[PDB]
Amino acid sequence: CRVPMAREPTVIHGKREVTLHLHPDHPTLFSYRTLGEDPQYHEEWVTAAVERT
Amino acid sequence: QPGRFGDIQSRTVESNDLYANTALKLARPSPGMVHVPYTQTPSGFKYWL
Amino acid sequence: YEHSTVMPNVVGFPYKAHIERPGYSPLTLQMQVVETSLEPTLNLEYITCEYKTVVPSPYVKCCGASECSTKEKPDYQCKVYTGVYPFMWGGAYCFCDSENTQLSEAYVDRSDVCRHDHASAYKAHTASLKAKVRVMYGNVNQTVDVYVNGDHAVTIGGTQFIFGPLSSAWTPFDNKIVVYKDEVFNQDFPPYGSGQPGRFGDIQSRTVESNDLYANTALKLARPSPGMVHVPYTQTPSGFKYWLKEKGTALNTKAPFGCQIKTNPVRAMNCAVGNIPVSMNLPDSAFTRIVEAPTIIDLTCTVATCTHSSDFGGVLTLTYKTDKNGDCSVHSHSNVATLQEATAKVKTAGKVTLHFSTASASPSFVVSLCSARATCSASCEPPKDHIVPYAASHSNVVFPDMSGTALSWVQKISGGLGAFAIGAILVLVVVTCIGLR
Amino acid sequence: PGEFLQVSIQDTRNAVRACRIQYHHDPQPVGREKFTIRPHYGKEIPCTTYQQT
Numbered sequence A: 001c002r003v004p005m006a007r008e009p010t011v012i013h014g015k016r017e018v019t020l021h022l023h024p025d026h027p028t029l030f031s032y033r034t035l036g037e038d039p040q041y042h043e044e045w046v047t048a049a050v051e052r053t
Numbered sequence B: 001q002p003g004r005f006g007d008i009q010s011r012t013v014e015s016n017d018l019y020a021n022t023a024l025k026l027a028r029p030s031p032g033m034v035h036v037p038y039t040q041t042p043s044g045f046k047y048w049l
Numbered sequence C: 001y002e003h004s005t006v007m008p009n010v011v012g013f014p015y016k017a018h019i020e021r022p023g024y025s026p027l028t029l030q031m032q033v034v035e036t037s038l039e040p041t042l043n044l045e046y047i048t049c050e051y052k053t054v055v056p057s058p059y060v061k062c063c064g065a066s067e068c069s070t071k072e073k074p075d076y077q078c079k080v081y082t083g084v085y086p087f088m089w090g091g092a093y094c095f096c097d098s099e100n101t102q103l104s105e106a107y108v109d110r111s112d113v114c115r116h117d118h119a120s121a122y123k124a125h126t127a128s129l130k131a132k133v134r135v136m137y138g139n140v141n142q143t144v145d146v147y148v149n150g151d152h153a154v155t156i157g158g159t160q161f162i163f164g165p166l167s168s169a170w171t172p173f174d175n176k177i178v179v180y181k182d183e184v185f186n187q188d189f190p191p192y193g194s195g196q197p198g199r200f201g202d203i204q205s206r207t208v209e210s211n212d213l214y215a216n217t218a219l220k221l222a223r224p225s226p227g228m229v230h231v232p233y234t235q236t237p238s239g240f241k242y243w244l245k246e247k248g249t250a251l252n253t254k255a256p257f258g259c260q261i262k263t264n265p266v267r268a269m270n271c272a273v274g275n276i277p278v279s280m281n282l283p284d285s286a287f288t289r290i291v292e293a294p295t296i297i298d299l300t301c302t303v304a305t306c307t308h309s310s311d312f313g314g315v316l317t318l319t320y321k322t323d324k325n326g327d328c329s330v331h332s333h334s335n336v337a338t339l340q341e342a343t344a345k346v347k348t349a350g351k352v353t354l355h356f357s358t359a360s361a362s363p364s365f366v367v368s369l370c371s372a373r374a375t376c377s378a379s380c381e382p383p384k385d386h387i388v389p390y391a392a393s394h395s396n397v398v399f400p401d402m403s404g405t406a407l408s409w410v411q412k413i414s415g416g417l418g419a420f421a422i423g424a425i426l427v428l429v430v431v432t433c434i435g436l437r
Numbered sequence D: 001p002g003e004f005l006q007v008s009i010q011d012t013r014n015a016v017r018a019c020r021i022q023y024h025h026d027p028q029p030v031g032r033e034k035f036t037i038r039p040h041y042g043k044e045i046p047c048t049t050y051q052q053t
C-alpha cells in the first residue's frame, strides 16, 4: 500500500541543539533520541505547523 | 526565508523582480509513469495569516 | 608471526595497526567494521491474539425442561432459564405458557487470523555477536563475515584473523520481551495460565499451531428478555486490542548507543560499545626485507595547520633523506591523533605530507616512516561550525600534552610558588639551627 | 468513518428493507502518517486486504 512522505523540515544549527520547523499536510508522527548511554527520547503526533528544539 | 512571512517579495505591486526563497526541490519520478515530483515549504503568507 | 591488537567497536571508524618485525620493513593494517549484529537466544513462552466468541442457536424446549452439561471448551458457560414464551415470528413457537425452557451457551475461541496477527512472549539469554570487517593491507581489499568470539578464524590473503570476545556483556533486551511485527517491547508478561480479562494475555496459546487455547475473558450469560428469541451475554473486550493501543513505546524508539532493532531474527544492529581484541598470524610472504625498502635517515616533522574538528583537520609535513624511490608505511604512536593514510610515496625530493584528526588543543605524538621516527607538536584551534552530519574520526582524548600553552603556565606558577616555599623552609631551618646552639 | 452501519435492499414490492446496527469504524492507514488518499508520488509498505477470489 502506497503512503506519502513528509516534506523535509527547516534545520537551524545552534550550540548543542537544532531547531526544526515542521509543516504537515495531515497528522504526522515525529520522534527523536540521542545516541548515547541514556537515550533521552520523545514521540509526538504533530497536526499543525510547529517549531521544536 | 521559507515558510515565514516574506518568503517571496516584490518591490511594488506591479514590479517584476520577485525575490523567492521557498525551498523548492525536485525528485526522481517513480518507475513507469509521467509526472514531476517535488517538495517545497508551504507559503509563509498563509502561515502569517 | 603473531600479533595482537585491540580495535574499537564503532561502525565506520578506520583502525590502523602497526607490525614491527625486526629484519623486515614495518606493515600497517587497515581494518574497520562495516556492520554489527547482536542476537539473543529466544525461548517461546506463548502466543496471544484476539479472541472470537462462539454463540450457537438457543435450544427452546416447548412443554418440558432441560438440564446443563459441562463441556471442555475454553471459558465455557451454560444456563437454563425456566419460564419463557418465545414468540418466534408470526406466532408463539410454543403452546404451553410457562413450561418452556431455553438453554443458552457460549464459549471463547481463537481468532480466524491468529496466524497473521499475533504477538509473542519470549525469554532472552546470552547473545551472540557477529560483525563484518573489511581488511586492507598490501594489495588485498577483502571483507569477511566473522563471529566476534575467540572461536572463529577467517583468512584474508594468507593471514589468520581471530576477533576476540567483546570487552563487555551489555545487551539492550531484558529477560522478557514481546515481538509484535517489526518492533520489540521490554515487557513483563503474565505467566502461562495466568492471564486476566481485558489485559495482555487474556487468552494464551503455547504455539501458533497448538490446541490448548487457555482463556480468561470474564464471559457471563444473561436471561433473555420476555417475548423474543436471543441469547444475551457480557464479556470484557479483548486485551490484545487494548494492548495494541496502550503498549507504551517500543524498544526501537529508545535504545542506547543507537542500536537498530530488527526483523524476524530479533537483533540489535550497530551498537557502539566495547572493544574487539584481534589476533593475527601473518605469513613471511606478506613482509618485505629491509634490503628492498628505502632507507630513510634524519626525519623531522612540522605541522602546518591544525583544527581539532571531527574531520581530518590537521596537516603535517615530513622532511627526510632517502636513497631510492619507494613506498613506506606511516603510523602514529598515540591515539591522540589519527592518521588518514597507511602508506606514503617516498621521493628524493625530501617532502611528504599527511593529514590527521584530533580533539586536543595541543597534541603531541610520534610519527614514523618505514624506518625512522619523529615527534610532532602542534597548537590546534577549535572549529566554528556547530553541527555536522558525520561522526568523529578520532578518540575523544582531550587532555592536553604537557609543554603546551595551558600546562606551561601551570608549571611556571608551580615553580614560582615552590621556589618561594623552599626559600621559606631554608630560612626557617637556618634560623632555628643557629638558635638551637 | 461513522458511528453506525446500515445495509438495505429493495424487495419484490419495491419497499425498502433496512437493518441498522451500532459499529465504530474509525480506520487509520499504515505507516507514520494519517493521510486520506494515496498520492501520485510516494513509498510502498506491506498491507493486508480481503482478496476477491
Ligand SMILES: *[C@@H]1O[C@H](CO)[C@@H](O)[C@H](O)[C@H]1NC(C)=O
Binding pocket: C136, C141
Ligand atoms: C576496497 O573496495 C571498496 C569497494 O569495493 C572500495 O570502496 C574501497 O575504496 C576499496 N579500497 C581501496 C583502498 O581501494
